[PDB]
Amino acid sequence: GYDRHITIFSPEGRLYQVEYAFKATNQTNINSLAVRGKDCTVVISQKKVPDKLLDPTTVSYIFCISRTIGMVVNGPIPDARNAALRAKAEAAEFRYKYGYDMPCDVLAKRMANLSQIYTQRAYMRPLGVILTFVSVDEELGPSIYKTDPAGYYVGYKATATGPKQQEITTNLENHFKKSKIDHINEESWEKVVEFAITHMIDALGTEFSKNDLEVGVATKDKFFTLSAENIEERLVAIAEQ
Amino acid sequence: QFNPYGDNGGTILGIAGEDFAVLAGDTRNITDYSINSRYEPKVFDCGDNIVMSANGFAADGDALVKRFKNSVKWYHFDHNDKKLSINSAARNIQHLLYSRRFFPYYVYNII
Amino acid sequence: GSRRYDSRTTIFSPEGRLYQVEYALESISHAGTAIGIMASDGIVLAAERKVTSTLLEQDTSTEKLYKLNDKIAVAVAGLTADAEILINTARIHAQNYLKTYNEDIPVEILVRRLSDIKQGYTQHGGLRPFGVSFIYAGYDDRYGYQLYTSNPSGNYTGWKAISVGANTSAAQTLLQMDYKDDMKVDDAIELALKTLSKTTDSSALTYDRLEFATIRKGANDGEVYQKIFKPQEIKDILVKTGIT
Amino acid sequence: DRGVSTFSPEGRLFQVEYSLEAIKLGSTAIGIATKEGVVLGVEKRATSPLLESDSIEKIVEIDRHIGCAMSGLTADARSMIEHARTAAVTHNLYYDEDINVESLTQSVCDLALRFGELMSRPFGVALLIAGHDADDGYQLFHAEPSGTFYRYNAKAIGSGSEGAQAELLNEWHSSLTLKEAELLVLKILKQVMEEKLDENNAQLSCITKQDGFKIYDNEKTAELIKELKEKEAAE
Amino acid sequence: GYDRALSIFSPDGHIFQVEYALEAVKRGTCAVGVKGKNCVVLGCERRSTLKLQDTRITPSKVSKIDSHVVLSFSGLNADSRILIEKARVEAQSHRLTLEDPVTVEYLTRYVAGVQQRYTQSGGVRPFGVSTLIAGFDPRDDEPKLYQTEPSGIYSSWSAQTIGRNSKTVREFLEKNYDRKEPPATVEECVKLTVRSLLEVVQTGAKNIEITVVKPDSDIVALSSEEINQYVTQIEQEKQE
Amino acid sequence: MTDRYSFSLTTFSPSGKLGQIDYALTAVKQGVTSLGIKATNGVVIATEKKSSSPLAMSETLSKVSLLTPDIGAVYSGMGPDYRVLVDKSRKVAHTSYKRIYGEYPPTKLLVSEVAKIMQEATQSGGVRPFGVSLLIAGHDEFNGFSLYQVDPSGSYFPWKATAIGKGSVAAKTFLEKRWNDELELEDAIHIALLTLKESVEGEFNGDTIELAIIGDENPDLLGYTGIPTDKGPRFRKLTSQEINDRLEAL
Amino acid sequence: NNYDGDTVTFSPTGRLFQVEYALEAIKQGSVTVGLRSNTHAVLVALKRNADELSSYQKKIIKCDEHMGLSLAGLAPDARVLSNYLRQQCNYSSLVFNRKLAVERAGHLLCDKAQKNTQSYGGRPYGVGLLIIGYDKSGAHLLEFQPSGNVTELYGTAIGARSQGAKTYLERTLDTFIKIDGNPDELIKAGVEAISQSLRDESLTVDNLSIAIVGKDTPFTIYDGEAVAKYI
Amino acid sequence: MDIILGIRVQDSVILASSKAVTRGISVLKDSDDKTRQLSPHTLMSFAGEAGDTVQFAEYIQANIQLYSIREDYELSPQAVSSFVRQELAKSIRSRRPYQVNVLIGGYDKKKNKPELYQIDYLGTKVELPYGAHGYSGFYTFSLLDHHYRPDMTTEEGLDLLKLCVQELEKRMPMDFKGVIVKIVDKDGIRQVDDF
Amino acid sequence: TGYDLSNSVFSPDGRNFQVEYAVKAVENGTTSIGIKCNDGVVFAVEKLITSKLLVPQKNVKIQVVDRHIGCVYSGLIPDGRHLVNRGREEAASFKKLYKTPIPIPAFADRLGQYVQAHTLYNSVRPFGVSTIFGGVDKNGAHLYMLEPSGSYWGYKGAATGKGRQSAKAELEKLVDHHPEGLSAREAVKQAAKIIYLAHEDNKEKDFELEISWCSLSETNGLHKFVKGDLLQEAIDFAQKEIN
Ligand SMILES: [Cl-]
Ligand SMILES: [Mg+2]
């Protein structure tokens, strides 16, 4: 039974190492969510600092890949950082070679191709991570593209990742079934973040303090993460209506 | 254009006696019409009762002597502290010099 | 490390056989039968396509018979994809020889080169061998008309008539019975088709299940012509010989 | 399977230990060192009477002052001999002198452990390296595939080794002559050999300061065999 | 590159891959070598399971390495081509650098060295081939006959056989070949070579190949009819 | 580090089977149905856009891909494997042909190059075979229209019409009854939609179906005017609206 | 058990069995003792023979004028490692006109041995080394294990029955450290230490091997009748 | 080296090559054979830079001899000449080209025809009835243009060759120490020992 | 089963058992800690005295990287040294190209990526060390801890080795009782105490205390070893607290 140890086909036509890499994805027990506004793309993720000895400012699964592209990871931090460093290098090389900023979907495809190679070549293992790339693309507008250990990737209206992804997914599905549009009809990104947090609260059934969340926002020509105090202001506005 | 060679002057002299030998050399080091040092040793005790001097371009001379001294050290390690005879040292030095047949040590050597 | 997963494709059995070569030959025994018959005035190549469909585009299809140059052709038995790798190498070797010596490559020299490549995969590299057996049909001015075969072991031999693929035991017996040295091409054509008709696993032998080719000096004066038969031409020769 | 450079739980390299078993199956080779010279002798062991025995070359010249006998997978020895000859002559080129027997032996033994996943396995042959130099005089070395080499006053290797070594234990003393050593090798070879010893299935050689390394003629050895038979019948 | 050590020692001190290569030689067709007073003859078996063969173009069992040296073999056919090619290249390489053709002993030593190298090199398996190398040294009238095997050992033989049922024909040669008086003529040498193969071959038709090599690059292969005359004469004497 | 898997991972078993190729074909069997039909004046290739989530934008995932202006491709099996094959197929069309001869390769030769790449993954060291079967439709001046299937082994066959994946056995039977040598392109599209409806469970419309054709030259899709000999690509992907229009006449 | 096939595999308890098996080869090896004072450092080694006709395998190797070691285990591996030390000592002299510090020599050996314990294909070194030397910070003694662990000590012993000599040195610690400016008495303490590891056999003239280095003493080895003084 | 001539007659090819070898101002040898037998019915003469000539010739010889043994067959003169041309055309763009000009005289046993090929160091091949390299043609071609017929006997070819050498000996400043003449025909290669 | 026999193989859980086995080697090692203070960091380690023959203060365990970073580790000591050698190469190339000394977070990722790389292939073994490291840069003080998996985070206090639980408990008290912060000299005293308290898990053999520190005020942002009077002062403070 060595067909379960390396990335070769089982008799059923399956790659067990890829399937087990998907299971490593949920090892952190963190849930993430991404939605699109008119002018922005928002990504939120649960933040859990179990140890009091940790410096909470260094605990993060959201990465600034380029000025325009942000990336949230679902999976262990070593693989997450491996993917982050590679994506940063690829984004920079692209700009140097082709004279313009690497689009979000193109980076996703590139990282997905790298993931595919690990599923075909034996000496390389898959990374046990799911990568969600976000930006406000200059051609396509607000963009969410997600990559997994199988080498699969696709664009999204909105998306969710983690142990309780299904609950969040259905919650979002039901909202877009009502509104009948592919985005959150809202002007400011502040209110789009408030929407994202509100719908995560409803789906998971848990309340959040300022230190329980982690937020990333993509606007035209820049991606940035919110501080604890920026999130607190967001939580206050939710409670006051 | 860069010239990797130079001339540090000096003169050396070796004479073989019946049961002794001498190797002499002046201690002056020069470039062009200037004196670098009035006392810069040029003849060296290399071990195993062998003395050596590489005259001409000092940098190449120092490198060769340094390499031969090293060759004596490794001759002891590899051959059970055997004494390196003068005839064996001479042959060894020929191969040290010919290693740079196409970028020579610009020196006239006496042991 | 990686050693754990190595099949070791290039080793002897205790009996002194090469495992992978033997298993590759087992693969080839399930492939469509290919027959070669050499006559005094030409060579015949016949081969059976494997369980086809009505929706297969036959006239543009090629799975059995391939052209190496103007003088030499091959019939294939085994993995088609493996065979095409080798065929393209053989085509290049023939052109290299022509560029070097300004003469068409002798048949045996081309055969030896391909057979040497196959041999290499059985002795070094740790890769699986090519699951292919060839029948070479060719002509040169030294030995005239020649038939050769090569298999995954890289061993090659010359023949007057030979079969590869499925039912070679039965096919070789039938050829050995009816073959004669003073035979001609038209007779050899008939023998090849009759042998396939009796050895085939199909219910009946039809034009759409066959590939056919001849190498004749039946070209205007001292020169050689290769004829890869078209579907309609295979249908005609089947009626002529009285099989359909 | 398992690594080629793997240690056993006892702290030994599996492959080196297994190569030693191959050497035990090899034909017998004996060396005896004296103050008048070193004698090397071997069992030829032809597999058939049609095999021309004089083509069996299990005693070999490395330099004028160094000889070598082999036992085990003798085909493996050819590259070792080639390296030894090259090392001996190369040192003569660099230093205008003969190379020390120990230094030559050390150079050969440096090849031994150059195996892994370099060559794919250890050598399956042991060597008796005999010679003379000005510093340490007449010497006999036993070079194994482990990379280890011991100096010996007398040594036997091959299938009849432990029986021969026990005999060499009793017979050797520091005042042996060359003639006495010759007869002693013949005596012990005759004892451990399957077939009856003669000039065609056994070979002698020696290394002296004056004449250097010499392989003995079949006519010369035949006389030493006849001299042996008579002196054993003398008591 | 593929570096895997395929030929390795076993607990009992055997290299199984080298020994299994000898089993491939045992499977191969019988080859025999007999040297007379002024010649050497190489005999080879052709298995008659393969008829409808084209004997003009089929690779002959005996191969010329140079104008004065020949090589026959038993074992894997494809493997033998690689040794023959290397040998032929070395023969021309020796003529080019030393200005003399190879001695038979030198050529044998080279081929045996190649076989040995493939028993302790990574990623390769041993040659499943044993060879008989015969010929005459330049400006020498003494016959030469050598044998090699997968392990890489080689030796000189007055007469030798290799391949399937080689045990039987070696038995025949050991009692029939006299060293004090070897086959004085070509006829006697060929006759003894054919006789030895008739112990094993089956039919004396197209199953026996004979190649005579004489001094000064005089090499010829006998035809079917010439060999058939030896086969006829042998059995007619046997009916008594 | 270093790739130490320099040995084959696909090997012959005692029965003569190449396991990894067979297992790759099994992966293709599990894959979504795709098909191809050849007409007199064109070729059509089609498949189902099996969306993994309704939140996912299935327009961004392209199962039918342009390889050259006159050649297109569709697959069944593992999507990621297909994606990288398309990337390599597009590149090899330039490096091994267009940069040499100054024109795009004919269908059969591009197929041959793709087949070679897939064969090498079946024999080279430290790799598994591609888990896809490709259907490649194309046109060129001297061969006309053509349709090819390419399997994980590297073997390729020309077809008049065929299907691969989930419901291929049923679909091939359906095509045998409907296909003839006098079909016009619109008739082939109609048959493609009928055949594909049988294998689809859920929604069946322009947004859940991906369909492209190799047909007439499209000068409107060229992007420039002024060169008479350049008349535009023959490959065209049908829009969501164009599919739905033909579903009313179904 | 299942985790001892190669050096690249941890066991479930976090052990490296191939390294532990290499460590076992040292225990089979002949005993050797190391000890130092503030002025000198001494190596004492019990040499082993194959039989009565054979020579006694050399245990001590010189690396530089101011540094050398003694070995226990696979002798060829000691030759490889000592050769490396010779080169490193030599690189320090030729480039920096600087005698290599004994502590830095230990760090280099540690790092060389470590690479063999983390990579596939290779194997750990099957030898233990005792390095003595005199540098700018005085006399030094190091113990090298092929796991990579190098330890600076006042005194130690490795090989078969080495525990007896190690206990003796642990008692004598306060005495032999004070033996300054007296090479003969320091050697006596080393010979008396190695004697605690002997059974059946005793120290003979071609059995014993001693080495010393110090303030105005280059690394020199004593064998044969040169050690009869200490028997 | 200096002068190499070639002439193809009815049933043979005749190659004439100078005997002189010069180092500095001194003639070291006056009996040098500037030729190599490539196969029993193929002969190659050569001229060019010192050392390169023999090296190249012997390298070609080894390759053709290797081919002969492998196939048990003699390559045609045309095939050999094409192999030689390729080796020179390969050589001219090398780091250090081989500065060798050759004439290849052979008898094709299949076609029963003599054949003469002239190839220079660039890899410029031409089949000719008569040929030369260097300055040799400047003196000799006018005689050959006048006297040459294709139906000439071997004896007539030798007489016309003598006239060419006499003209060279009269009008060339260099003393080339006469020529060694060799004939290539159906029976093989032989040397004319008196010329 | 068989998933734990090879590195870089995912078990059906999604775990790399070979990395988890490397952690067992870390847990087997001696105790080492790190404390983040007001303007710097303090490192301390337990050195087991196996024998009287060990020369005191000679077998130094804590290692410096560049001139501003300190590294300490528990587990397989050679593996730790290998990691520091790489760290020194990374820090050198950073300074070569960018001029400024390597920032601590930047340095932490360099080690992290390198350790993580040894979980990607079966041809290499994971590191048998957890490494505590840190120092002072332009943005102030930073303390990090790096596991065999390549996982690392920033810390207020950090501990690893056989006595990590005991140490962690003591570190948690300091964080609670000093929200405003701890001074550099206080951190040295506390570091000594914690190692002494953590020595109850290795109580068979006696030990030697080793401390180092980087502080903006006390060491000018350079890594230095605590020596002489300041070391003895910390030992006395530690001994007073256990009694
Ligand atoms: Cl890519
Ligand atoms: Mg993999």
Ligand SMILES: [Mg+2]
């Ligand atoms: Mg010309």
